Design a binder for this molecule. Structure first.
Ligand SMILES: [Zn+2]
Ligand SMILES: [Zn+2]
Lengths: 406, 405
């Protein structure tokens, strides 16, 4: 490979520690990612130099901080190829973004004879908000099936679309399976029946170039902490005409133009959807994460992460006894797997005893676990700072897990 | 006896110039500055411990989860909650109030039933209730204030009736500085069966919070207004009430089980924390609580009262400026007006001399209407401000008078 992972790993202080006698091997990136020094420093510098509240200020630090905050929004626009920064809303995370759409677009409009369509592989954060709407409003949640290899069955997705489908909310890349779904095609199908389409981009945004104009999604949601940025910050993007037509979500300061006891007038987007003091430092840290990603080049990241995924896929199958769940043709670098006798929890615990961090559980996809007739899977989820040597060590530890239960 | 010179060394942002002038940061009611201990706690988390929390098997996840739940426990101690389970992490006071409006009040309140607030509420303790009134048909009632900036208690009591289901009241005012007699008001509200939320966004930086003694049913505050990071705040509520409320946001982490046939929700507090929480913000907030405790809130209050008294006398001695909000009990905030000079010009010219204040409506437009002004200028102080800073501010305010002589 041409990707200088040894140099890149120097940017991530957390990677250089031991877990008892063992080097940390951080293979839990789908749960959250580690941060480069550039992101940590951007947050610290904000508090050390520029901190003040944003908008409607007169003084120098407030003026500086406000332009830094709106500059972060503009960088988000460039990062996802939005038409305008006013379409880019700062939230806590993907979960809040989806709840905002569910309550501000769908709940005030959907009728009892209408439908919301999702896929079987959704994360709970792209299931529960829609279940809440259906319970209150009487509409039906429909679920498009997947095949055993972890791919959406496109013919059945199309069959579940109809003139009553008003909202389609679909996973871009799966945190459990790794599958990258053909979302541009799925969006085109959904638009043919008149539905609006939200993409859950929590995993995809760390690994692929996001272009919301090319995809033609109506909404796009992602989380900063899953893409090398701080916790507590995420983005809801939506088409301007839709966001304008939606009701506000949370109410209070900053999202109004005027408040009286006789009338309240709301602000224009994006501020319409940012109630109260925003997570100013989180937005600035997210902008630093985007700059960091761009400095590595997303094409270079994707080439290397493909090499990691291919190498680990071949290596875990060569260990013998472990079966991969999720073998789609297009994947982000995630491998879920099971053993026919050894419980997922024991795999994860024993791997951690050798410094290796994975996730063993349902990965917030309990309906997927049900589909695969398993209680849990174990999940290796990699990033561009992981290495072939780490993969080798992980496979040696998985062989020792077999030997514990020989 | 308060060693402000030593404390100021903890706040790196204070040590800079705005053009040729030392920064004088008098905008603490908008947001506060952070001590190195808080900045370092956030950086150290990302440098050493970062991982997602709960349901993890590996060392960093276990460490991060213990740190996150320990932060919740520190919040409990900080406000004297009965249990950490009652303490919910949100983005800020605004989100906390929306959560209660949507999860307690909207699913229960009937048309013509009433929500009672005071005239001095911040917009974040007005708009959520207006949203519920518009959708559910209930009625928003407003308890009046007197010209000195105090709640008129007799009229607050008069506005309470058998149909008052929710009372949401300011603890300390970001615009006036007033500290309201919330323990008495809560007793009055409970006599008619109402639940009471306290907006503690300003009070929590300046007073010892004891939710058990106040007997409020909910308490909301923001980390960034009490020396902590942005993006983190707290909703506290009585356990029995939180258990009876519907969830607010839905998704990962706040469930026990999800299927397409049935979804079972987690117990409090996790019931109300959907998706990955702001883990680093909670840890930074715990560092802010530790820092406040290291100074002692009794000592902070004594010194901040000295600052307020000194600045109140000094600005009245300048002549030409009138204080808005002269309550008997105040946090260290002075809003003021001039009869001819616009607030925007006061704030702009003060900033030209390095002095950071706020000139505007302070998210209390109905208060501005009550006082028949469009805006006020606001000095809002913290324990790292000094008498010399106050002197310089007043000299700058005299120069403003001379600009428009
Ligand atoms: Zn406002
Ligand atoms: Zn979950």
């Amino acid at each position: 490979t041409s990707f200088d992972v040894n140099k890149i790993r120097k940017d991530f202080p957390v990677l250089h520690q031991k877990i008892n006698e063992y080097d940390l091997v951080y293979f839990d990136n789908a749960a959250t990612t580690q941060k480069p020094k550039a992101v940590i420093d951007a947050i610290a510098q904000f508090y050390e130099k520029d901190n003040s509240n944003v908008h409607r200020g007169v003084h120098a630090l407030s003026v500086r901080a406000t332009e830094m905050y709106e500059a972060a929004r503009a960088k988000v626009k460039r990062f996802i190829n939005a038409r305008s920064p006013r379409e880019c809303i700062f939230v806590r995370g993907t979960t809040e973004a989806i709840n905002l759409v569910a309550q501000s677009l769908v709940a005030p409009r959907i009728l009892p004879d209408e439908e919301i369509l999702i896929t079987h592989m959704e994360h709970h954060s792209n299931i529960v908000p829609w279940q809440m709407v259906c319970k209150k409003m009487g509409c039906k949640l429909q679920v498009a099936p997947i095949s055993l290899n972890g791919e959406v069955i496109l013919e059945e997705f199309e069959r579940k679309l109809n003139e009553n489908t008003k909202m389609v909310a679909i996973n871009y890349a799966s945190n459990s399976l790794g599958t990258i779904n053909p979302v541009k095609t799925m969006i085109k199908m959904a638009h043919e029946v008149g539905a609006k389409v939200l993409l859950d981009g929590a995993q995809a945004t760390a690994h692929l170039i996001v272009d919301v104009q090319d995809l033609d999604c109506d909404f796009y949601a992602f989380s900063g902490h899953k893409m090398y940025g701080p916790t507590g910050i995420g983005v809801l993007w939506g088409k301007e005409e839709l966001l304008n037509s939606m009701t506000p979500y949370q109410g209070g300061g900053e999202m109004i133009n005027s408040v009286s006891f006789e009338a309240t007038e709301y602000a224009a987007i994006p501020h319409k959807f940012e109630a109260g003091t925003p997570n100013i430092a989180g937005a600035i840290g997210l902008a630093a994460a985007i700059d960091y990603i761009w400095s590595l080049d997303l094409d270079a990241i994707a080439e290397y992460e493909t090499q990691l995924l291919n190498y680990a896929t071949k290596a875990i199958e060569a260990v013998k006894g472990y079966n991969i769940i999720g073998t789609a043709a297009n994947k982000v670098p995630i491998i879920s797997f099971v053993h026919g006798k050894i419980h997922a929890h024991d795999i994860g615990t024993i791997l951690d005893s050798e410094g290796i961090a994975i996730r063993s559980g349902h990965h917030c996809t309990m309906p997927l676990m049900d589909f695969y007739d398993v209680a849990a899977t174990s999940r290796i989820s990699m990033s561009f700072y992981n290495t072939f040597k780490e993969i080798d060590y992980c496979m040696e530890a998985l062989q020792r897990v077999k030997e514990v239960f020989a």
